[PDB]
Amino acid sequence: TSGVESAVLRGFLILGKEDRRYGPALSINELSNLAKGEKANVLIGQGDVVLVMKRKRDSSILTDSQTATKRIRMA
Amino acid sequence: VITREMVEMLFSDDSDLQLATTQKFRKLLSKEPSPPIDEVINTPRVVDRFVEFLKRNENCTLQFEAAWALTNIASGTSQQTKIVIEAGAVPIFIELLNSDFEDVQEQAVWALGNIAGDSSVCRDYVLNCSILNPLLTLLTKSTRLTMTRNAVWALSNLCRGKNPPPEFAKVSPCLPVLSRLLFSSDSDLLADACWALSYLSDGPNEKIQAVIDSGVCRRLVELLMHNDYKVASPALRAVGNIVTGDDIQTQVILNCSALPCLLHLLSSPKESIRKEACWTISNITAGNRAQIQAVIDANIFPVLIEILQKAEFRTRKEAAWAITNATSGGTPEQIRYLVSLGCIKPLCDLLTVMDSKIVQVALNGLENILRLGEQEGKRSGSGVNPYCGLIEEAYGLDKIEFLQSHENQEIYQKAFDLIEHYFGV
């Protein structure tokens, strides 16, 4: 691949070959718009398509601050 | 339960009987363990009558008792909160934020906090009724500690949620207020303020920039070292979210000397702290080569490698990302340094875990090391990959071969290609 494609893909983890469960491939210049935690196919090199996700990961797979969303006034 | 005279007195025409009755209803809902919320709202006209008393600005105590009664109703299930909203209480409660009575103000905040904290639908509705400007005014003009706590907690409820997140334009003006609140010493205040900041910094880098622009980073980093876990934990969450931004944004956190704090938090006795410290560091090592180097100079990697092989598994997962991200963005000298710390062995050991995602992360870190080994074998004509032997020593080759029995196609295809490319006979 090119220097640009290599540099861009450093911020991403290549999960595998093209998976059309995630739709038509993004271009390299569109790839930065991919939401954190999501997966997308991307066009690279000479027509190759791979599935990727950002290495920058959001706090999704973590614990909760569920206590407390609601508080009742007693006493 | 309710009585017939309660109903009849509530709809009388004298404030003496009204205030006494509302206080009876209020006392019922303000009682443990199981409040009669349904019986009160099922009783016709009652909810509407409470809401009508919120408009009685001439009778301070009546307003207070009314707001309290509605507050405890909106503290129940989603359907119980629906009745209060559809009664039209929300636009009135917001007006009461500028009540001349402080006891009415604070209870209005509490009610609105409960309503907004019900769901994303109610949250957006409360925001659409323009709660932010009166609420922030109240917060800055407050003169009581109990009032500020309630205001910040309600504010944090306006920010909470990701399905869908609130419209950022409707919640971002609270950032200057939130920024100043970080300088308080009250633990409860700092806790909810840091949660609100973590909610706002949870998403695309545009939102993160707005958080940064308010100048909260320096203080957020200092709060990493707070002795109360109710404060350090959300503060770490906020810092962790900010370093999910681009290289420039992440650098702001680093220039606040966050790394020595994060190093310290890696040794925390609390399990969730180490994990999120690892998670935070993993998003930094996903940065540029100067930032990876900053993690090296902070002596973080020897600890991450100890964690990678011996810590609680949900902590190992995040350390794996931290090591792997470092191997993808790092220089040959940096990767050579990770190898010298003995990172290959605990990476190989993760190839056999049942979390298929961590397997791929492990595989990626190993492939990164292998590719650099191959490039290194060409820049000196030796044609020998120096890391192939180390991976064999750590039984990585056997484990990679074993992955050809893994049901997951991505893992299979990956292990298959690694063997074909780096371990051909």
Short mmCIF file of C-alpha atoms in Angstrom, two decimals:
data_model
loop_
_atom_site.label_atom_id
_atom_site.label_comp_id
_atom_site.label_asym_id
_atom_site.label_seq_id
_atom_site.Cartn_x
_atom_site.Cartn_y
_atom_site.Cartn_z
CA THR A 1 0.00 0.00 0.00
CA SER A 2 0.89 3.70 -0.22
CA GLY A 3 2.49 5.81 2.50
CA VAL A 4 -0.79 7.63 3.05
CA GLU A 5 -2.81 4.43 3.40
CA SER A 6 -0.23 2.93 5.75
CA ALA A 7 -0.13 6.05 7.93
CA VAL A 8 -3.92 6.29 8.13
CA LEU A 9 -4.40 2.58 8.88
CA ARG A 10 -2.08 2.88 11.90
CA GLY A 11 -5.01 4.39 13.77
CA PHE A 12 -7.07 1.32 12.90
CA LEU A 13 -7.17 -2.40 13.62
CA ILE A 14 -7.70 -4.59 10.55
CA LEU A 15 -10.19 -7.21 11.72
CA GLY A 16 -10.26 -9.24 8.50
CA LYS A 17 -11.44 -9.48 4.89
CA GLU A 18 -14.41 -7.54 3.48
CA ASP A 19 -17.61 -8.28 5.42
CA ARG A 20 -20.72 -6.97 3.66
CA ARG A 21 -22.69 -7.16 6.88
CA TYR A 22 -21.25 -3.66 7.35
CA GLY A 23 -22.05 -2.41 3.86
CA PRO A 24 -20.18 -0.71 0.99
CA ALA A 25 -16.56 0.26 1.67
CA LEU A 26 -15.46 3.70 2.81
CA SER A 27 -12.56 5.39 1.05
CA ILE A 28 -9.37 6.20 2.96
CA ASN A 29 -10.29 9.89 3.14
CA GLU A 30 -13.73 9.04 4.56
CA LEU A 31 -12.37 6.54 7.09
CA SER A 32 -11.60 9.19 9.73
CA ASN A 33 -15.35 9.85 10.05
CA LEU A 34 -15.97 6.32 11.34
CA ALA A 35 -17.52 6.37 14.82
CA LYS A 36 -15.39 5.01 17.65
CA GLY A 37 -16.27 1.40 18.42
CA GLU A 38 -17.93 0.78 15.06
CA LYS A 39 -16.72 -1.40 12.19
CA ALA A 40 -16.50 -0.59 8.50
CA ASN A 41 -15.02 -1.85 5.27
CA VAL A 42 -12.47 0.37 3.56
CA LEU A 43 -10.94 0.52 0.07
CA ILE A 44 -7.15 0.28 0.11
CA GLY A 45 -4.34 -0.26 -2.39
CA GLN A 46 -5.29 -1.89 -5.68
CA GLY A 47 -8.98 -2.57 -5.06
CA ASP A 48 -8.57 -4.56 -1.85
CA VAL A 49 -11.25 -4.22 0.83
CA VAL A 50 -10.76 -4.94 4.54
CA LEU A 51 -12.84 -4.64 7.72
CA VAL A 52 -11.55 -2.24 10.39
CA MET A 53 -12.21 -0.40 13.64
CA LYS A 54 -10.54 2.58 15.30
CA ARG A 55 -7.83 1.82 17.84
CA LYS A 56 -9.15 4.83 19.76
CA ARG A 57 -11.84 3.12 21.84
CA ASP A 58 -14.77 4.73 23.66
CA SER A 59 -15.84 3.80 27.19
CA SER A 60 -18.60 1.47 25.97
CA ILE A 61 -17.23 -1.82 27.28
CA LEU A 62 -16.97 -0.62 30.89
CA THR A 63 -19.07 -0.32 34.06
CA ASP A 64 -21.98 1.96 34.96
CA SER A 65 -22.70 5.01 37.11
CA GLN A 66 -26.34 3.92 37.34
CA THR A 67 -26.54 5.18 40.93
CA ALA A 68 -28.33 7.34 40.93
CA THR A 69 -30.46 8.64 38.06
CA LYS A 70 -33.49 9.14 40.29
CA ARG A 71 -33.65 10.26 43.93
CA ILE A 72 -36.76 10.36 46.10
CA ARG A 73 -37.06 12.89 48.93
CA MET A 74 -37.88 11.13 52.19
CA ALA A 75 -38.17 11.92 55.91
CA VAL B 1 -54.30 4.67 51.27
CA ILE B 2 -56.31 7.77 50.36
CA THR B 3 -59.51 9.02 51.99
CA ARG B 4 -62.59 10.72 50.54
CA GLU B 5 -62.13 13.90 52.57
CA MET B 6 -58.57 14.15 51.28
CA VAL B 7 -59.95 14.30 47.75
CA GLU B 8 -62.69 16.77 48.70
CA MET B 9 -60.39 19.05 50.71
CA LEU B 10 -57.78 19.08 47.95
CA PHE B 11 -60.29 20.71 45.60
CA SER B 12 -61.64 23.23 48.12
CA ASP B 13 -61.24 27.00 47.75
CA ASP B 14 -59.22 27.92 50.83
CA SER B 15 -55.43 27.67 51.07
CA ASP B 16 -55.67 26.33 54.63
CA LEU B 17 -57.35 23.09 53.54
CA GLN B 18 -55.30 22.82 50.34
CA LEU B 19 -51.91 23.12 52.05
CA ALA B 20 -52.90 20.62 54.73
CA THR B 21 -54.12 18.10 52.16
CA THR B 22 -51.16 18.44 49.81
CA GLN B 23 -48.96 17.92 52.88
CA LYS B 24 -50.86 14.71 53.63
CA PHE B 25 -50.34 13.47 50.07
CA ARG B 26 -46.72 14.58 50.29
CA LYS B 27 -46.25 12.68 53.55
CA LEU B 28 -47.72 9.53 52.00
CA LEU B 29 -45.29 9.65 49.08
CA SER B 30 -42.47 10.56 51.47
CA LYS B 31 -42.77 7.29 53.37
CA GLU B 32 -40.88 3.99 53.30
CA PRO B 33 -40.61 1.32 52.00
CA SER B 34 -43.14 1.18 49.14
CA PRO B 35 -44.71 4.57 48.28
CA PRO B 36 -48.32 4.54 46.98
CA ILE B 37 -47.45 6.23 43.68
CA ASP B 38 -50.07 4.42 41.60
CA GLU B 39 -52.94 5.04 44.03
CA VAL B 40 -52.22 8.78 43.96
CA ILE B 41 -51.94 9.10 40.18
CA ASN B 42 -54.83 6.70 39.53
CA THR B 43 -57.03 8.93 41.67
CA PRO B 44 -58.49 11.31 39.04
CA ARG B 45 -57.52 15.00 38.81
CA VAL B 46 -55.00 14.64 41.66
CA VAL B 47 -51.84 14.96 39.55
CA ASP B 48 -53.31 17.96 37.73
CA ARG B 49 -54.20 19.56 41.07
CA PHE B 50 -50.62 19.28 42.34
CA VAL B 51 -49.39 20.90 39.12
CA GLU B 52 -51.94 23.68 39.50
CA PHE B 53 -50.53 24.47 42.96
CA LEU B 54 -47.06 25.05 41.47
CA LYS B 55 -48.49 28.24 39.97
CA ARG B 56 -49.54 29.56 43.39
CA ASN B 57 -46.66 32.02 43.78
CA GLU B 58 -48.50 33.77 46.61
CA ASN B 59 -48.34 30.67 48.79
CA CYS B 60 -44.70 29.62 49.22
CA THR B 61 -45.41 26.59 51.41
CA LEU B 62 -48.10 25.34 49.03
CA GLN B 63 -45.68 25.46 46.09
CA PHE B 64 -43.05 23.62 48.14
CA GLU B 65 -45.41 20.83 49.21
CA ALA B 66 -46.75 20.50 45.67
CA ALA B 67 -43.30 20.27 44.08
CA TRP B 68 -42.20 17.69 46.65
CA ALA B 69 -45.28 15.55 46.02
CA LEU B 70 -44.65 15.60 42.27
CA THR B 71 -40.93 14.98 42.81
CA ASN B 72 -41.58 11.66 44.53
CA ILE B 73 -44.01 10.67 41.78
CA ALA B 74 -41.43 11.41 39.08
CA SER B 75 -38.97 9.25 41.03
CA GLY B 76 -40.89 6.11 40.12
CA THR B 77 -41.20 4.11 36.91
CA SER B 78 -41.30 5.54 33.39
CA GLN B 79 -45.10 5.48 33.19
CA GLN B 80 -45.39 7.27 36.53
CA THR B 81 -43.11 10.02 35.23
CA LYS B 82 -45.14 10.17 32.01
CA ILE B 83 -48.21 11.31 33.95
CA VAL B 84 -46.29 14.18 35.56
CA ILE B 85 -44.86 15.36 32.24
CA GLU B 86 -48.20 15.11 30.45
CA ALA B 87 -49.70 17.10 33.32
CA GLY B 88 -47.55 19.98 32.07
CA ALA B 89 -45.35 20.26 35.15
CA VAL B 90 -42.05 20.63 33.29
CA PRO B 91 -42.50 24.14 31.85
CA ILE B 92 -43.85 25.28 35.24
CA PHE B 93 -41.03 23.64 37.20
CA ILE B 94 -38.54 25.52 35.01
CA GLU B 95 -40.25 28.80 35.86
CA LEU B 96 -39.93 27.87 39.53
CA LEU B 97 -36.15 27.80 39.06
CA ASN B 98 -36.42 31.59 39.27
CA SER B 99 -38.79 31.47 42.24
CA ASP B 100 -38.10 34.06 44.94
CA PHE B 101 -38.33 31.23 47.48
CA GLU B 102 -35.14 29.17 47.75
CA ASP B 103 -36.98 26.14 49.14
CA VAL B 104 -39.18 26.19 46.03
CA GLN B 105 -36.16 26.60 43.77
CA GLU B 106 -34.24 23.61 45.13
CA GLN B 107 -37.26 21.31 44.97
CA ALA B 108 -37.85 22.41 41.38
CA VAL B 109 -34.28 21.38 40.56
CA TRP B 110 -34.78 18.00 42.23
CA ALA B 111 -38.03 17.39 40.34
CA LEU B 112 -36.51 18.34 36.98
CA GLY B 113 -33.53 16.13 37.79
CA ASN B 114 -35.80 13.15 38.39
CA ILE B 115 -37.81 13.84 35.23
CA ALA B 116 -34.75 14.25 32.99
CA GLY B 117 -33.13 11.16 34.51
CA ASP B 118 -36.02 8.96 33.42
CA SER B 119 -35.06 8.39 29.79
CA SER B 120 -33.44 9.98 26.74
CA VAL B 121 -36.92 10.99 25.56
CA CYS B 122 -37.68 12.86 28.79
CA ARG B 123 -34.14 14.26 28.85
CA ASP B 124 -34.44 15.85 25.40
CA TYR B 125 -37.91 17.13 26.30
CA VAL B 126 -36.65 18.87 29.44
CA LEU B 127 -33.79 20.37 27.41
CA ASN B 128 -36.21 21.52 24.71
CA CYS B 129 -38.17 23.43 27.36
CA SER B 130 -35.04 25.56 27.86
CA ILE B 131 -34.00 24.39 31.33
CA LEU B 132 -30.30 25.08 30.84
CA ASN B 133 -30.18 28.87 31.19
CA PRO B 134 -32.33 29.10 34.33
CA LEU B 135 -30.52 26.08 35.84
CA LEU B 136 -27.05 27.52 35.21
CA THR B 137 -28.18 30.88 36.59
CA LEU B 138 -29.41 29.15 39.73
CA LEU B 139 -26.14 27.22 39.98
CA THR B 140 -23.94 30.32 39.78
CA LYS B 141 -26.20 32.36 42.08
CA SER B 142 -26.54 29.57 44.65
CA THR B 143 -25.72 30.24 48.31
CA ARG B 144 -26.33 26.77 49.74
CA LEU B 145 -24.31 23.57 49.37
CA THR B 146 -27.42 21.37 49.11
CA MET B 147 -28.71 23.48 46.23
CA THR B 148 -25.49 23.26 44.19
CA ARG B 149 -25.31 19.49 44.63
CA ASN B 150 -28.86 19.08 43.34
CA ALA B 151 -28.19 21.45 40.43
CA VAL B 152 -25.01 19.66 39.32
CA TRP B 153 -26.65 16.24 39.71
CA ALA B 154 -29.59 17.42 37.59
CA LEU B 155 -27.12 18.88 35.10
CA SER B 156 -25.33 15.54 34.88
CA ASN B 157 -28.68 13.91 34.11
CA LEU B 158 -29.12 16.32 31.21
CA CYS B 159 -25.80 15.10 29.79
CA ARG B 160 -26.17 11.37 30.45
CA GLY B 161 -27.15 9.03 27.62
CA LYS B 162 -25.86 7.68 24.33
CA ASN B 163 -28.96 6.15 22.73
CA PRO B 164 -29.33 8.76 21.46
CA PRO B 165 -26.92 11.31 22.95
CA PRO B 166 -28.42 14.75 23.65
CA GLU B 167 -28.00 17.42 20.97
CA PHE B 168 -24.59 18.82 21.86
CA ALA B 169 -25.62 22.39 21.06
CA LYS B 170 -28.24 22.18 23.82
CA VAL B 171 -25.89 20.89 26.53
CA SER B 172 -22.46 22.38 25.72
CA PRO B 173 -23.17 25.83 27.24
CA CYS B 174 -22.87 24.28 30.72
CA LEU B 175 -19.14 23.69 30.15
CA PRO B 176 -17.88 27.00 31.59
CA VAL B 177 -19.98 26.44 34.72
CA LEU B 178 -18.80 22.84 34.97
CA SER B 179 -15.21 24.02 34.54
CA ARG B 180 -15.40 26.36 37.54
CA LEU B 181 -17.11 23.71 39.68
CA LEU B 182 -14.04 21.49 39.41
CA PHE B 183 -12.29 23.83 41.84
CA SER B 184 -14.64 23.05 44.72
CA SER B 185 -13.60 20.76 47.57
CA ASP B 186 -16.95 19.02 47.97
CA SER B 187 -16.62 15.36 46.98
CA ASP B 188 -20.27 14.96 45.94
CA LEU B 189 -19.96 18.06 43.77
CA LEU B 190 -16.69 16.99 42.12
CA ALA B 191 -18.10 13.51 41.50
CA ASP B 192 -21.18 14.58 39.54
CA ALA B 193 -19.21 17.31 37.76
CA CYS B 194 -16.69 14.74 36.55
CA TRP B 195 -19.50 12.41 35.46
CA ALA B 196 -21.09 15.22 33.45
CA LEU B 197 -17.73 15.97 31.82
CA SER B 198 -17.28 12.29 30.97
CA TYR B 199 -20.72 12.23 29.33
CA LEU B 200 -19.93 15.33 27.29
CA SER B 201 -16.51 14.03 26.25
CA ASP B 202 -18.00 10.68 25.19
CA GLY B 203 -18.19 10.78 21.40
CA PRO B 204 -16.67 12.37 18.26
CA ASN B 205 -13.66 14.67 18.63
CA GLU B 206 -15.73 17.81 18.02
CA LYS B 207 -17.44 17.28 21.37
CA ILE B 208 -14.08 16.54 22.98
CA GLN B 209 -12.64 19.81 21.66
CA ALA B 210 -15.46 21.78 23.29
CA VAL B 211 -14.63 20.08 26.59
CA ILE B 212 -10.95 20.93 26.12
CA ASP B 213 -11.74 24.52 25.08
CA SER B 214 -13.33 25.11 28.51
CA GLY B 215 -9.97 24.36 30.15
CA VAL B 216 -10.97 21.46 32.42
CA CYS B 217 -8.00 19.25 31.55
CA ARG B 218 -5.51 20.50 34.05
CA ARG B 219 -7.94 20.13 36.93
CA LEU B 220 -9.28 16.77 35.71
CA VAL B 221 -5.71 15.44 35.75
CA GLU B 222 -5.16 16.66 39.32
CA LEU B 223 -8.38 14.96 40.41
CA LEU B 224 -6.91 11.63 39.27
CA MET B 225 -5.00 11.67 42.57
CA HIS B 226 -8.03 12.37 44.78
CA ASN B 227 -8.30 10.07 47.81
CA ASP B 228 -12.04 9.53 47.29
CA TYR B 229 -12.89 6.85 44.72
CA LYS B 230 -16.19 8.59 44.01
CA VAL B 231 -14.10 11.40 42.53
CA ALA B 232 -11.01 9.70 41.08
CA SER B 233 -13.09 7.16 39.15
CA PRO B 234 -15.21 9.58 37.12
CA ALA B 235 -12.21 11.90 36.76
CA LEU B 236 -10.33 8.99 35.21
CA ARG B 237 -13.30 8.31 32.96
CA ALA B 238 -13.28 11.91 31.72
CA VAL B 239 -9.51 11.91 31.12
CA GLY B 240 -9.87 8.52 29.46
CA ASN B 241 -12.52 9.86 27.10
CA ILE B 242 -10.48 12.94 26.19
CA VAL B 243 -7.50 10.84 25.09
CA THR B 244 -9.81 9.05 22.65
CA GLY B 245 -9.39 12.25 20.65
CA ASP B 246 -6.79 12.88 17.96
CA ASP B 247 -3.07 13.34 18.58
CA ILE B 248 -3.31 17.09 19.25
CA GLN B 249 -6.14 16.72 21.78
CA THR B 250 -4.46 13.80 23.53
CA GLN B 251 -1.29 15.89 23.89
CA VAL B 252 -3.15 18.37 26.09
CA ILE B 253 -3.71 15.67 28.71
CA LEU B 254 -0.06 14.59 28.47
CA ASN B 255 1.20 18.16 28.97
CA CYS B 256 -0.78 18.21 32.23
CA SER B 257 1.59 15.48 33.47
CA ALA B 258 -1.09 12.77 33.46
CA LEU B 259 1.25 9.84 32.80
CA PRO B 260 2.87 9.76 36.26
CA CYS B 261 -0.65 9.78 37.73
CA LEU B 262 -1.71 6.94 35.43
CA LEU B 263 1.41 5.00 36.38
CA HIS B 264 0.43 5.40 40.02
CA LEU B 265 -3.17 4.33 39.33
CA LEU B 266 -1.90 1.12 37.70
CA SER B 267 -0.99 0.01 41.23
CA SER B 268 -4.38 0.94 42.69
CA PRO B 269 -5.95 -1.54 45.15
CA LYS B 270 -9.27 -0.88 43.40
CA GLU B 271 -9.79 -3.22 40.45
CA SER B 272 -11.82 -0.85 38.25
CA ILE B 273 -9.15 1.85 38.55
CA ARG B 274 -6.36 -0.32 37.14
CA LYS B 275 -8.59 -1.42 34.26
CA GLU B 276 -9.54 2.12 33.27
CA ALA B 277 -5.97 3.29 33.82
CA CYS B 278 -4.96 0.58 31.35
CA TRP B 279 -7.81 1.61 29.05
CA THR B 280 -6.68 5.24 29.16
CA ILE B 281 -3.06 4.31 28.42
CA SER B 282 -4.18 2.07 25.55
CA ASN B 283 -5.77 5.08 23.85
CA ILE B 284 -2.56 7.08 24.33
CA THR B 285 -0.33 4.36 22.86
CA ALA B 286 -2.70 4.45 19.89
CA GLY B 287 -1.25 7.93 19.31
CA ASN B 288 1.84 9.16 17.47
CA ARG B 289 5.46 8.16 18.07
CA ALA B 290 6.21 11.05 20.43
CA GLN B 291 3.33 9.98 22.66
CA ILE B 292 4.33 6.32 22.68
CA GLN B 293 7.79 7.54 23.70
CA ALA B 294 6.20 9.57 26.50
CA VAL B 295 4.69 6.35 27.86
CA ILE B 296 8.11 4.70 27.67
CA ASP B 297 9.81 7.53 29.55
CA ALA B 298 7.14 7.32 32.26
CA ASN B 299 8.23 3.72 32.94
CA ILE B 300 4.71 2.44 32.32
CA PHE B 301 5.40 -0.55 30.05
CA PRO B 302 7.18 -2.77 32.59
CA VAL B 303 4.01 -2.56 34.71
CA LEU B 304 1.66 -3.14 31.75
CA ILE B 305 3.56 -6.33 30.91
CA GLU B 306 3.25 -7.55 34.49
CA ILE B 307 -0.49 -6.79 34.28
CA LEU B 308 -0.73 -8.49 30.88
CA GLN B 309 0.23 -11.87 32.35
CA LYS B 310 -0.96 -11.84 35.97
CA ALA B 311 -3.81 -9.36 36.50
CA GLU B 312 -7.58 -9.86 36.57
CA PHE B 313 -8.66 -10.78 33.04
CA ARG B 314 -10.78 -7.69 32.32
CA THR B 315 -7.68 -5.70 33.23
CA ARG B 316 -5.46 -7.88 31.02
CA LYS B 317 -7.70 -7.12 28.04
CA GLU B 318 -7.01 -3.39 28.26
CA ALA B 319 -3.28 -3.90 28.81
CA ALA B 320 -3.25 -6.06 25.68
CA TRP B 321 -4.70 -3.17 23.67
CA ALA B 322 -2.08 -0.91 25.23
CA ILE B 323 0.80 -3.14 24.16
CA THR B 324 -0.71 -3.96 20.77
CA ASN B 325 -1.51 -0.34 19.90
CA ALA B 326 2.08 0.51 20.79
CA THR B 327 3.40 -2.15 18.38
CA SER B 328 1.33 -0.78 15.49
CA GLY B 329 2.30 2.88 15.79
CA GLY B 330 5.78 2.62 17.28
CA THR B 331 9.25 2.95 15.76
CA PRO B 332 11.45 -0.13 15.29
CA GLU B 333 13.50 1.00 18.30
CA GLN B 334 10.35 1.32 20.39
CA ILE B 335 9.07 -2.14 19.43
CA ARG B 336 12.57 -3.50 20.03
CA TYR B 337 12.27 -2.02 23.53
CA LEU B 338 8.92 -3.72 24.22
CA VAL B 339 10.41 -7.04 23.11
CA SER B 340 13.35 -6.49 25.48
CA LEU B 341 10.85 -6.15 28.32
CA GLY B 342 9.53 -9.60 27.46
CA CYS B 343 6.19 -8.73 25.85
CA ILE B 344 6.09 -11.61 23.36
CA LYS B 345 5.51 -14.37 25.93
CA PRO B 346 2.48 -12.80 27.65
CA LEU B 347 1.10 -11.82 24.22
CA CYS B 348 1.36 -15.43 23.04
CA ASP B 349 -0.39 -16.67 26.19
CA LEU B 350 -3.49 -14.67 25.25
CA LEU B 351 -3.80 -16.54 21.95
CA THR B 352 -5.68 -19.28 23.82
CA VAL B 353 -8.29 -17.16 25.66
CA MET B 354 -11.99 -17.60 24.88
CA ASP B 355 -12.48 -13.87 24.24
CA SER B 356 -12.10 -13.95 20.46
CA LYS B 357 -11.57 -10.18 20.33
CA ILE B 358 -8.55 -10.26 22.65
CA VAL B 359 -7.16 -13.09 20.52
CA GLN B 360 -7.19 -10.81 17.47
CA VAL B 361 -5.56 -8.03 19.48
CA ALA B 362 -2.86 -10.48 20.58
CA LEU B 363 -2.44 -11.72 17.00
CA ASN B 364 -2.11 -8.12 15.80
CA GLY B 365 0.64 -7.24 18.26
CA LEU B 366 2.52 -10.39 17.27
CA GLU B 367 2.08 -9.72 13.55
CA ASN B 368 3.30 -6.15 14.03
CA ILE B 369 6.44 -7.45 15.73
CA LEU B 370 6.88 -10.03 12.97
CA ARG B 371 6.50 -7.50 10.16
CA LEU B 372 9.11 -5.24 11.75
CA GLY B 373 11.31 -8.31 12.08
CA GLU B 374 10.94 -8.95 8.36
CA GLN B 375 11.69 -5.35 7.40
CA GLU B 376 14.69 -5.54 9.72
CA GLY B 377 15.83 -8.68 7.91
CA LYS B 378 15.93 -6.76 4.64
CA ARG B 379 17.68 -3.59 5.89
CA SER B 380 20.75 -5.73 6.61
CA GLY B 381 20.44 -8.50 4.03
CA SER B 382 20.53 -11.23 6.67
CA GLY B 383 17.10 -12.45 5.57
CA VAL B 384 16.51 -13.66 9.11
CA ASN B 385 13.54 -12.59 11.23
CA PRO B 386 14.95 -12.11 14.77
CA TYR B 387 11.52 -12.40 16.41
CA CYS B 388 10.45 -15.70 14.84
CA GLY B 389 12.67 -17.57 17.28
CA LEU B 390 11.36 -15.70 20.32
CA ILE B 391 7.78 -16.44 19.33
CA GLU B 392 8.68 -20.11 18.87
CA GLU B 393 10.29 -20.11 22.33
CA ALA B 394 7.09 -18.72 23.84
CA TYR B 395 5.13 -21.50 22.12
CA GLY B 396 3.50 -18.84 19.97
CA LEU B 397 3.86 -20.93 16.82
CA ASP B 398 2.09 -23.89 18.42
CA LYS B 399 -0.70 -21.63 19.68
CA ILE B 400 -1.02 -19.91 16.30
CA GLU B 401 -1.25 -23.35 14.65
CA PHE B 402 -3.84 -24.33 17.28
CA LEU B 403 -5.93 -21.34 16.21
CA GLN B 404 -6.61 -23.24 12.99
CA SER B 405 -9.13 -25.14 15.13
CA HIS B 406 -10.85 -21.91 16.18
CA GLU B 407 -14.43 -21.53 14.94
CA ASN B 408 -13.99 -17.81 14.27
CA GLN B 409 -13.18 -17.24 10.58
CA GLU B 410 -11.22 -14.01 11.10
CA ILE B 411 -8.98 -15.70 13.65
CA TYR B 412 -8.61 -18.80 11.46
CA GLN B 413 -7.82 -16.80 8.32
CA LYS B 414 -5.36 -14.69 10.31
CA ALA B 415 -3.52 -17.60 11.96
CA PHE B 416 -3.48 -19.33 8.56
CA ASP B 417 -1.81 -16.34 6.88
CA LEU B 418 0.76 -15.78 9.64
CA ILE B 419 1.93 -19.38 9.32
CA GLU B 420 2.11 -19.10 5.53
CA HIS B 421 3.98 -15.78 5.60
CA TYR B 422 6.35 -15.94 8.57
CA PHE B 423 6.68 -19.66 9.31
CA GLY B 424 6.87 -21.39 5.92
CA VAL B 425 8.80 -24.65 5.61
#
